[PDB]
Design a protein around this ligand. Structure first.
Ligand code: 0KX
Ligand code: MG
Ligand code: MG
Length: 430
DNA sequence: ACGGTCACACT
DNA sequence: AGTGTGAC
């Protein structure tokens, strides 16, 4: 009991933008605002794939990955913003740049880890101690947490959601012992205050609304963030974990969404995260491996040690395009032209990256898929990247994958390529 | 015909 | 260096 480590050492927040691509388009185009809206790419095929959905639109059942034509059936008045197309492919520059706006603001408060284009993890442990020191035996007002939810509260002895939020928050605050600096719950609470400030700054400065989860680790922070979206932040305490995890589907936990989560469910015959507590660390390790087993054992107990990496920028800069079914490239000239298009966009992004971030990519990775292959990549190959030259990069990429072309004629390409991928990696200071 | 990107574990 | 999984 005295020696058991509860994973309450850190205060971690995950801030995730609400329907991010939609918001970027909405900010730029006021007409989209407060309306059922979605962002689509490649309009020609079935109206284009939906990649982002406004909350008004989600009410109609519109979802990501839905074809726009299908979405229209559910929501006749659905408004659509198209992903920019450059050189015959979708260009995500606007959203990347919008992401930078958010990331830079967040970086002001603490070192951040860029988990995705629209979200980043924040370790507020240092910030919290300092803030706790700044306010002395200073009780924390509810006003400082206007958008905060306390998961699991209210409990025990208004049918409006805001009323519920307030009751829960009040129960939490009344419970709090302000005087003790060490208390994890107090630390989470102060962390929540900062997140409120972080989120207000984001909205004021970009016009983008976001949600956040405050907890002692990344997994819990991420899970918490989703609980009260949109435009709200949720504090998941260590104590709330048992009840929260008791009915929490295993797939919900980050990294348990795929095969591992399925095997975990299949092998152990359980549905909920909480049920994982019944197994010894060794038991979990035997089925899912040493690293996974330890992670699962600690995680179902609300404990995770994965640190918030200090990484604001992406480690890689990549361009890729799919050429599905009939559109697969079956000629050498075709492959070369598309490689060139990818290389050109990559070059523009690489050049801007070098100026902005003082770094150069020393390695080029070329990936392709042949028709009928199961795998996302038929082949992956890498060559040195010494110049930010689109022609050289595309020329080099062709050299690397050219032998994949079986056909004797060599003016043709067989099998036709379903996918082309170019990625710049191994960045170095410059 | 569930696209375009990213990170990272395993080998 | 290459492959596969998971995420968003
Ligand atoms: N499969 C996916 C998932 C997300 N994205 C993009 C579009 C999203 O707007 C953006 C952020 O992803 P997301 O946070 O998981 N969902 P989104 O931000 O749109 O809505 P929220 O549920 O977070 O409020 O990345 C994508 O392009 N392809
Ligand atoms: Mg989001
Ligand atoms: Mg996200």
């Amino acid at each position: 009991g005295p020696h058991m480590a509860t994973g309450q050492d850190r205060v971690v927040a995950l801030v995730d933008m609400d329907c991010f691509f939609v918001q970027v388009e909405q900010r730029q185009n006021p007409h989209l605002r407060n309306k059922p809206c979605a962002v689509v790419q490649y309009k020609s095929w079935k109206g284009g794939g939906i990649i982002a959905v406004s909350y008004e639109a989600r009410a109609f059942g519109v979802t990501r990955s839905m074809w726009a034509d299908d979405a229209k059936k559910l929501c006749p008045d659905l408004l659509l913003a198209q992903v920019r197309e450059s050189r015959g492919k979708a260009n995500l520059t606007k959203y990347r740049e919008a992401s930078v706006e958010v990331m830079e603001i967040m970086s002001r408060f603490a070192v951040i880890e860029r988990a995705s284009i629209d979200e980043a993890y924040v370790d507020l442990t240092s910030a919290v101690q300092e803030r706790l020191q700044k306010l002395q035996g200073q009780p924390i007002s509810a006003d400082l947490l206007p958008s905060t939810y306390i998961e699991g509260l209210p409990q025990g002895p208004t049918v409006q959601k805001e009323g519920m939020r307030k009751q829960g928050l009040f129960q939490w605050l009344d419970s709090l012992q302000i005087d003790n600096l060490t208390s994890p719950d107090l630390q989470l609470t102060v962390g929540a205050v900062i997140v409120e400030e972080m989120r207000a700054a984001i909205e004021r400065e970009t016009g983008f609304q976001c949600s956040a989860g405050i907890s002692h680790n990344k997994v819990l922070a991420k899970l918490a963030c989703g609980l009260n979206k949109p435009n709200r932040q949720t504090l998941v305490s260590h104590g709330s974990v048992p009840q929260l995890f008791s009915q929490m589907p295993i797939r919900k936990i980050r990294s348990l969404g795929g095969k591992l989560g399925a095997s975990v469910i299949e092998i152990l015959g359980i549905e909920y995260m909480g049920e994982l507590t019944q197994f010894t660390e060794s038991q979990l390790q035997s089925h899912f491996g040493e690293k996974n087993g330890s992670w699962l054992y600690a995680m179902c107990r609300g404990i995770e040690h994965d640190p918030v990496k200090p990484r604001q920028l992406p480690k890689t800069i990549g361009c890729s395009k799919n050429f599905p079914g009939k559109t697969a490239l079956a000629t050498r000239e075709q492959v070369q032209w598309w490689l060139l298009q990818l290389a050109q966009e990559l070059e523009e992004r690489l050049t801007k990256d070098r100026n902005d971030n003082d770094r150069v990519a020393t390695q080029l990775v070329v990936s392709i898929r042949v028709q009928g292959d199961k795998r996302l990549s038929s082949l992956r190959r890498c060559c040195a990247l010494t110049r930010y030259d689109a022609h050289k990069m595309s020329h080099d990429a062709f050299t690397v994958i050219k032998n994949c072309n079986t056909s004797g004629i060599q003016t043709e390409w067989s099998p036709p390529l379903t996918m082309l991928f170019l990625c710049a990696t191994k960045f170095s200071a410059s």
